[PDB]
Amino acid sequence: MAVKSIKVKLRLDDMPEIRAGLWKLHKEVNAGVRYYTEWLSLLRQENLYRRCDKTAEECKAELLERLRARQVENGHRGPAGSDDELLQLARQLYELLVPQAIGAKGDAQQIARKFLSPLARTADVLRALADFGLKPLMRVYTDSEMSSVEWKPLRKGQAVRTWDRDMFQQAIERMMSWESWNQRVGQEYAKLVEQKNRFEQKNFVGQEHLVHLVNQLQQDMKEASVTGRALRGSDKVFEKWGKLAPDAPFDLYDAEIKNVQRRNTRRFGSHDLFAKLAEPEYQALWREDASFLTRYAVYNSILRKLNHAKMFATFTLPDATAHPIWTRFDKLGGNLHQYTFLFNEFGERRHAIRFHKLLKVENGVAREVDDVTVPISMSEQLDNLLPRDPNEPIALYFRDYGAEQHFTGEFGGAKIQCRRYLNVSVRVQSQSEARGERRPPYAAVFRLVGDNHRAFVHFDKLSDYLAEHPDDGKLGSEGLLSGLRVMSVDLGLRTSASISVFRVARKDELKGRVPFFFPIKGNDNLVAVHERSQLLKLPGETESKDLRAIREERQRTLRQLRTQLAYLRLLVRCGSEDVGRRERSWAKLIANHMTPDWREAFENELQKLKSDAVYESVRRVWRHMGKQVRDWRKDVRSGERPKIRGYAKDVVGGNSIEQIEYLERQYKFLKSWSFFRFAITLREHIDHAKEDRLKKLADRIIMEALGYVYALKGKWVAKYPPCQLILLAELSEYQFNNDRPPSENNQLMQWSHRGVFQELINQAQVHDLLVGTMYAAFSSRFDARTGAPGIRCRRVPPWWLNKFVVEHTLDACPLRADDLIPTGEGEIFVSPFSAEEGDFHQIHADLNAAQNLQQRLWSDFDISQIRLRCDWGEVDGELVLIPRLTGKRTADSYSNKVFYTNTGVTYYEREEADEAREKSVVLMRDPSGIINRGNWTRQKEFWSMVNQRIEGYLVKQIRS
RNA sequence: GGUCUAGAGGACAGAAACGGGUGUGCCAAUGGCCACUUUCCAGGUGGCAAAGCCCGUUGAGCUGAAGUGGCACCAGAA
């Protein structure tokens, strides 16, 4: 069962007497839920936090005043009851109403309908509370004096109107979601404290004073105004400073800092730290232990994640405006106020919805009416809905491009909404759910485990499936019962998605070439045959000559304005007293990426200051940008540019990540410029374009998994048999010598991979597509066919080429086009096939990582086959390595084993998600026996060995 | 055609006025004017109004016929 909430808009222009009754109805259920929810917070009688400690444990006295007042209100003069039975039944009824407060389970259906009418183990609390004269603990909101409107009179026989049943139930669900929220937040904060405590007791044992001296250093920074990003180049500094003396002039310490920048300006920063680290006070940090600051930089990241987390949740009462709660409805046949969806009551595409119980006002009185048909504004989403049964005004057919047979569905609930509208949830029934099957017939071959849908295979029942479901070659959604196919998707930066289709067939087949295939563990007759592999590109990821020129000029103006602020922030330092602000920033500023207008004015104020004094210059140049940043803001906010009419290929940015980074880089610039709510119109536009990318990228992967192709004028065609298991990449927080930073250093990529996963699970619930993930660590570094690792390179027709010549001094020799050059983020993947240097195996980098996930799927791959973290032990005398048991499968093959060495770079063996570094070394291996004959090689030595193979040859073929 | 395997939509560099509708947003797609926010910039706030918007109907245009919009959507809440 898959629900789809179709939000639509009502038109009430011809009937103001119903709109005013709808806004009033919104205030009735909101003030009602607020009345029923506040009572639950008092019955909770705990801390009850907020944005602070307001109403902190003070509900005990506020409940008693609200509880004692009802004893004299209901004619009770027998057993009064001490202040214990008051608080006893208070917490006892609360844990009885919402079972999520103690860790139990309870659905809000038979809870609100059970406790409302009596109040307006279970039988003991309801009876002992009714003994204390509190038989009427709650008068309903509609019949009391709180509701200013005149509802329909409660009929003789019915206890409570359905309106208050919707308020009392909605208040229970809000408190259920609260206790599960407060507990989960406290549990995550408990694991974060454990992460800090156990990391603190492993690295800072004998170094108790060094931690306190770092807190001296960090407090010295903020009062005068330490992560891994700010320590880039620490070992280079500590190596050259060890050749110096403490009682040396400070210029000598500064001399070594400016030298290490000549090697790599890309990875260096924070000159103020090393200047304050060279002080005679903070020398025990880098002299007593040459790696303490690096060990502490990870400890600061744990506190960074710890500070951005609470140990309690924030409680907010449902206000009718600030924190609104929407008036719910029920499907035609429920037990509360229902609604009926009317198909084509005002026209061909003019729908309407009649409400069985509503409100209407004219001047100042509001009364309850019946059967209020309201037309509905047209929508493309409603075009996919067709009525299935005129006698059942709930059953409906759901249209979708990825299916030629319309799904049978049923209308769900409804709730009237506003923006700071009527949400009609449509329960769409999948094809397998309509056949009477809970899980699809192919859901037994795989086993999605855990939260991230870890896809594991049951090879025993695989042979039985192909014999029951042979390949008849049916295209589209009709072929879900035909054969078995798995599509591996690798979300990338340049190409939005690189996919590869593998079918399972026996023996062999096939104008005369032989298709690629992957061996499947267990069965020796069937083998995963590669069917097709293509690049799925959203509009905006195609690179041409004219498109680059458009992208360069739209960024060059922001390139000039953003780098200008960096020079203005260097000038504001020269107007201070500290040497780091005045002295160091002065000598620095005393190749044309600036605005020539502001560049000329900046050099003028500099030369005038070369001969509070800078405070005038720092505020005269700031006004100059105000002229430039305004003429540029209005040029972006209201300037007219060409826009796509119809369907146009070769788009500028489109749905690419470049368009998302552009919208973000503007928000990050306006936030950094004004601070020398915020941009509500731009921020909401960034989230919309980001939300639009996730929805479009999740549908294109699914439409490809089903075999539909959008061809040109614009029509989806079922061109391939459908896949049955969308194999995604496993997502993890840590990265260790795997992806080139851009596709991971960009904290946007993690949002993309997280957002695509959530949207894929939702959209694939209708098509019965199994969404699973495979471990993606080092999926782009190793080859899929040969299994040998390699460096990422690309061709040549430059950000990467100029740095490639600085490394290898290739300014003299020329080169012909289409020569392989490693960049780190290479467009193509290269790998050695044999021991012959010069002979390599080239393949698209993003597609090789996708096909690598497939090889991991049919072979039950584990990272223990490649990577392994060991500890330095002393087993049987020698100083051998001891592997670490991360995961049950890693432990099976390396339990009793132990790794020894004679050189330190090559290791031989003799018989969570947290990582502590540098305590011992990590080693990896090559499956093809090419690099180091397939032995366990140290991490740094192994990748340099691979780089020496590929990058060694293709450069030796350039100089010669 | 050059280069690269996975042999596919292959892959990187190349080259030649009237009548209706305005669910939520994307696709070079971030609204304008005025007032105020101490003063110009960013951000915010309030007020104002005309429409901008697509879609349908042709005589326009020759890029006699053709074509002047494509795409996706599962909501909600601190």
Swiss-Prot record:
<dbReference type="Pfam" id="PF22126">
    <property type="entry name" value="C2c1_RuvC-like"/>
</dbReference>
<dbReference type="GO" id="GO:0003677">
    <property type="term" value="F:DNA binding"/>
</dbReference>
<feature type="site" description="Binds sgRNA">
    <location>
        <position position="666"/>
    </location>
</feature>
<feature type="region of interest" description="Binds non-target ssDNA">
    <location>
        <begin position="778"/>
        <end position="781"/>
    </location>
</feature>
<comment type="similarity">
    <text>Belongs to the CRISPR-associated endonuclease Cas12b family.</text>
</comment>
<feature type="region of interest" description="RuvC-II domain">
    <location>
        <begin position="677"/>
        <end position="781"/>
    </location>
</feature>
<feature type="site" description="Binds 'phosphate lock' on target strand DNA; via amide nitrogen">
    <location>
        <position position="413"/>
    </location>
</feature>
<feature type="region of interest" description="Binds DNA protospacer adjacent motif (PAM) on target DNA">
    <location>
        <begin position="109"/>
        <end position="113"/>
    </location>
</feature>
<feature type="active site" description="For DNase activity of RuvC domain">
    <location>
        <position position="729"/>
    </location>
</feature>
<feature type="site" description="Binds sgRNA">
    <location>
        <position position="350"/>
    </location>
</feature>
<feature type="site" description="Binds sgRNA">
    <location>
        <position position="516"/>
    </location>
</feature>
<dbReference type="GO" id="GO:0004519">
    <property type="term" value="F:endonuclease activity"/>
</dbReference>
<dbReference type="InterPro" id="IPR054009">
    <property type="entry name" value="C2c1_WED-II"/>
</dbReference>
<feature type="region of interest" description="Binds sgRNA">
    <location>
        <begin position="377"/>
        <end position="381"/>
    </location>
</feature>
<feature type="site" description="Binds sgRNA">
    <location>
        <position position="421"/>
    </location>
</feature>
<feature type="region of interest" description="Bridge helix domain">
    <location>
        <begin position="545"/>
        <end position="574"/>
    </location>
</feature>
<feature type="site" description="Binds sgRNA">
    <location>
        <position position="763"/>
    </location>
</feature>
<feature type="region of interest" description="Binds sgRNA">
    <location>
        <begin position="716"/>
        <end position="720"/>
    </location>
</feature>
<keyword id="KW-0694">RNA-binding</keyword>
<feature type="site" description="Binds sgRNA">
    <location>
        <position position="419"/>
    </location>
</feature>
<keyword id="KW-0540">Nuclease</keyword>
<feature type="site" description="Disrupts base stacking adjacent to scissile phosphate">
    <location>
        <position position="734"/>
    </location>
</feature>
<keyword id="KW-0460">Magnesium</keyword>
<feature type="region of interest" description="Binds sgRNA">
    <location>
        <begin position="842"/>
        <end position="847"/>
    </location>
</feature>
<feature type="active site" description="For DNase activity of RuvC domain">
    <location>
        <position position="490"/>
    </location>
</feature>
<feature type="region of interest" description="Nuc-I domain">
    <location>
        <begin position="782"/>
        <end position="843"/>
    </location>
</feature>
<feature type="region of interest" description="Binds non-target ssDNA">
    <location>
        <begin position="493"/>
        <end position="494"/>
    </location>
</feature>
<feature type="region of interest" description="RuvC-III domain">
    <location>
        <begin position="844"/>
        <end position="862"/>
    </location>
</feature>
<feature type="region of interest" description="Binds sgRNA">
    <location>
        <begin position="4"/>
        <end position="9"/>
    </location>
</feature>
<feature type="region of interest" description="RuvC-I domain">
    <location>
        <begin position="439"/>
        <end position="544"/>
    </location>
</feature>
<dbReference type="InterPro" id="IPR054012">
    <property type="entry name" value="C2c1_helical_2nd"/>
</dbReference>
<feature type="region of interest" description="Binds sgRNA">
    <location>
        <begin position="641"/>
        <end position="645"/>
    </location>
</feature>
<dbReference type="InterPro" id="IPR053603">
    <property type="entry name" value="Cas12b_endonuclease"/>
</dbReference>
<feature type="site" description="Binds sgRNA">
    <location>
        <position position="710"/>
    </location>
</feature>
<dbReference type="Pfam" id="PF22077">
    <property type="entry name" value="C2c1_Nuc-II"/>
</dbReference>
<feature type="site" description="Binds 'phosphate lock' on target strand DNA">
    <location>
        <position position="427"/>
    </location>
</feature>
<keyword id="KW-0378">Hydrolase</keyword>
<dbReference type="InterPro" id="IPR054011">
    <property type="entry name" value="C2c1_RuvC-like"/>
</dbReference>
<keyword id="KW-0051">Antiviral defense</keyword>
<feature type="site" description="Binds sgRNA">
    <location>
        <position position="633"/>
    </location>
</feature>
<dbReference type="GO" id="GO:0051607">
    <property type="term" value="P:defense response to virus"/>
</dbReference>
<comment type="subunit">
    <text>Monomer.</text>
</comment>
